[PDB]
Amino acid sequence: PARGTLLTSNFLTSYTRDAISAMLASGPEQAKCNVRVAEFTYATIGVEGEPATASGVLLIPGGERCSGPYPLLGWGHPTEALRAQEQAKEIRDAKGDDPLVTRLASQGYVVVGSDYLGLGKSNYAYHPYLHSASEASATIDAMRAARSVLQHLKTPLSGKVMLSGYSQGGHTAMATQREIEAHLSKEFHLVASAPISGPYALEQTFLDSWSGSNAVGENTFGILLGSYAIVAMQHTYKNIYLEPGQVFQDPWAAKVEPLFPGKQSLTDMFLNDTLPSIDKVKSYFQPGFYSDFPSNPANPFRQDLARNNLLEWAPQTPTLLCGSSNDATVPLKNAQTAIASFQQRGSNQVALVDTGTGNASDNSAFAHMLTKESCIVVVRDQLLDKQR
Ligand SMILES: CCCCCCCCO[C@@H]1O[C@H](CO)[C@@H](O)[C@H](O)[C@H]1O
Ligand SMILES: CCCCCCCCO[C@@H]1O[C@H](CO)[C@@H](O)[C@H](O)[C@H]1O
C-alpha cells in the first residue's frame, strides 16, 4: 500500500465546547469549538524504507461558533516507553482533559499525531526513539491518512499546515519540518512550526549531561532516557553492541532491551527504580563505554546521535522554539545552539521564547513536564494564531 494509505478509522467520542470550557475552569480561557476524537491506522515505512503500519489520533473541531476552514496541525508526542500506548484512547480515557483538546482543537485546530513506529497499533518490532527520518515519515504519513479521513467527512481545511511537539515530540516536530521543507512543500503548505523543549542539539544534549548534571541542574531522568536512546539506536543502526553487556553492567544488561518499549511507562520505571538513579551511573554503564562516549566522536552511540542532530539546515518556515531555562532534562540551550547554526546558515526564521521563572532556584529536571502546556499556550498565541 502507498505511504499514507488509511487502513482503519473510527470515532471514539466527542466533547462540547461547554464541556471543554468546564475542564479549563476546573484546571480562564473558553473553548470555541466542540472536539471530535478519532483514531486511525495507516500504511507507512520502517527505518529501511520497508512497509510498516502505525496508529494515530485525529482531533476535529466543530460547532456553530467554530466554522472552518481549519488549519492542520501535526503533533509529536513525548517519550513513550509503554509499547501499547495509543494517544487517542489515552485522551478518551482522560475524559478529553488534554491540552491537545483543551488548548488547540478547542480553538479551531485540526490536530493529527502519530503514535510512532513500534507504539500503539504499529506492527514495528521496536520504536526508533529519536530517529529523525522515521519520526518524520510516521508524522507525514499520519497527516496523509488523516487528510483522507477529513476529505471523507468533508471537514473544511484551509490548506495551511503547522507543526508542534513536546520533548521527544519537539525533535519530531523539527525533523518533520526539515523533511517537508526539503521535499514536500507543495503537498504541505507549512506556515508555522513550534517545537517545544526538544533536543535539536541531540549529540550535544547527551554530552553536556553525561556526568549526570548540566549547567541547568541534574538530568534526573537521564538514565531512563539515555537507555531508551541506546537500545533504540542499536535496533536502528546495529552498530553499538553484539549484546547488551558491552554497554550495560549486570543485572541491567539483561533487562534493558525489553523495557524500551515495554510493559512499563517511564513513570512506573522512575517510581519503582527499575534502573539506578544518576548518582550511580558509574555502576550502571560499563566503564569503557562510559569514558569512550564523551572522548570519542566516533563512538557508535555518539555517531548515531549525531546522525539525528537537527542543526545543519536553514529553516524556511517561521519557527518558534519554546522551552524553559529551568528545564534540566532538555536544556533550553538546545534552542540557542539550533538558532545559532540556522542563522550561520542564512536563516533568520527561527525565534526562541522562554517560559521559565528566571530564578535558578526553580531549576529542575521536573520543570520539563511543565513546559508542555505552558508552551502550547504561548506558541499558539505568539505564532500559530498569527499564521492560520
Ligand atoms: C527527548 C530527548 C530527551 C533527552 C534526555 C537526555 C538526558 C541525559 O541524561 C544523562 O544521560 C546520560 C546517559 O544515560 C547519563 O550518563 C547521565 O547520568 C544523565 O544525566
Ligand atoms: C520526560 C519523562 C520523565 C519521566 C520520569 C518522571 C515522570 C514524572 O511523572 C509525571 O509527572 C508530571 C507532573 O510533574 C505529570 O504531569 C505526568 O503525568 C507524570 O507522568
Coordinates of N, CA, C and O and ligand atoms in Angstrom, one line a residue, residues 78-80 129 166-168 220-222 224-225 265-271 329-330 365-370 372, ligand 2:
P78 N 5.5 13.1 23.3 CA 6.7 12.9 24.1 C 7.2 11.4 24.2 O 6.5 10.5 23.8
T79 N 8.3 11.2 24.9 CA 8.9 9.9 25.1 C 7.8 8.9 25.7 O 7.2 9.2 26.7
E80 N 7.6 7.8 25.0 CA 6.6 6.8 25.4 C 7.3 5.4 25.5 O 7.7 4.9 24.5
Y129 N 13.4 5.4 18.7 CA 13.5 6.6 19.6 C 14.5 7.6 19.1 O 15.6 7.3 18.8
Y166 N 6.2 18.1 21.8 CA 6.9 18.4 23.1 C 7.9 17.3 23.5 O 7.6 16.1 23.3
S167 N 9.0 17.7 24.0 CA 10.1 16.8 24.4 C 10.6 16.0 23.2 O 11.1 16.6 22.3
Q168 N 10.4 14.6 23.2 CA 10.9 13.9 22.0 C 10.0 14.5 20.9 O 10.5 14.5 19.7
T220 N 18.0 14.2 36.1 CA 17.4 13.1 36.8 C 16.9 11.9 36.1 O 17.1 10.8 36.5
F221 N 16.2 12.1 35.0 CA 15.6 11.0 34.2 C 16.5 10.5 33.1 O 16.1 9.6 32.3
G222 N 17.7 11.1 33.1 CA 18.7 10.7 32.0 C 19.0 9.2 31.8 O 19.3 8.8 30.7
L224 N 17.0 6.7 32.3 CA 15.9 6.1 31.6 C 15.9 6.6 30.1 O 15.8 5.7 29.2
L225 N 16.0 7.9 29.9 CA 16.0 8.4 28.5 C 17.3 8.0 27.7 O 17.1 7.6 26.5
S265 N 5.6 2.2 31.9 CA 5.7 3.6 31.4 C 6.9 4.1 32.0 O 7.5 3.6 33.0
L266 N 7.4 5.3 31.5 CA 8.6 5.9 32.1 C 8.4 6.2 33.6 O 9.3 6.1 34.4
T267 N 7.1 6.6 33.9 CA 6.8 7.0 35.3 C 6.9 5.7 36.2 O 7.5 5.8 37.3
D268 N 6.4 4.6 35.7 CA 6.5 3.4 36.5 C 7.9 3.1 36.8 O 8.3 2.9 38.0
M269 N 8.8 3.1 35.8 CA 10.2 2.9 35.9 C 10.9 3.8 36.9 O 11.7 3.4 37.7
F270 N 10.6 5.1 36.9 CA 11.2 6.1 37.8 C 10.8 5.8 39.2 O 11.6 5.7 40.1
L271 N 9.5 5.7 39.4 CA 8.9 5.4 40.8 C 9.4 4.1 41.4 O 9.7 4.1 42.6
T329 N 16.2 18.6 32.1 CA 16.1 17.4 31.3 C 16.5 17.6 29.9 O 17.4 16.9 29.3
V330 N 15.9 18.7 29.3 CA 16.3 19.1 27.9 C 16.6 20.6 28.0 O 15.7 21.4 27.8
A365 N 14.9 18.9 36.8 CA 14.6 18.0 35.7 C 13.1 18.0 35.6 O 12.6 17.8 34.5
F366 N 12.4 18.2 36.7 CA 11.0 18.2 36.8 C 10.3 19.4 36.1 O 9.1 19.3 35.8
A367 N 11.0 20.5 35.8 CA 10.4 21.6 35.2 C 10.1 21.3 33.7 O 9.3 22.0 33.1
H368 N 10.7 20.2 33.2 CA 10.4 19.7 31.8 C 8.9 19.5 31.6 O 8.4 19.9 30.6
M369 N 8.3 18.7 32.5 CA 6.9 18.4 32.3 C 6.0 19.7 32.3 O 4.8 19.6 31.8
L370 N 6.4 20.8 32.9 CA 5.7 22.0 33.0 C 5.6 22.8 31.7 O 4.7 23.6 31.4
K372 N 5.2 21.6 28.6 CA 4.2 21.1 27.7 C 3.0 22.0 27.5 O 2.9 22.7 26.4
Ligands
LIG2 C1 10.5 13.2 30.5 C2 9.9 12.0 31.1 C3 10.2 11.9 32.6 C4 9.7 10.6 33.2 C5 10.1 10.4 34.7 C6 9.3 11.5 35.5 C7 7.8 11.2 35.5 C8 7.1 12.1 36.4 O1 5.7 11.8 36.4 C9 5.0 12.8 35.7 O2 4.7 14.0 36.5 C10 4.0 15.0 35.8 C11 3.8 16.2 36.7 O3 5.1 16.6 37.3 C12 2.7 14.5 35.3 O4 2.0 15.6 34.5 C13 2.8 13.3 34.4 O5 1.5 12.7 34.1 C14 3.6 12.2 35.2 O6 3.9 11.1 34.3

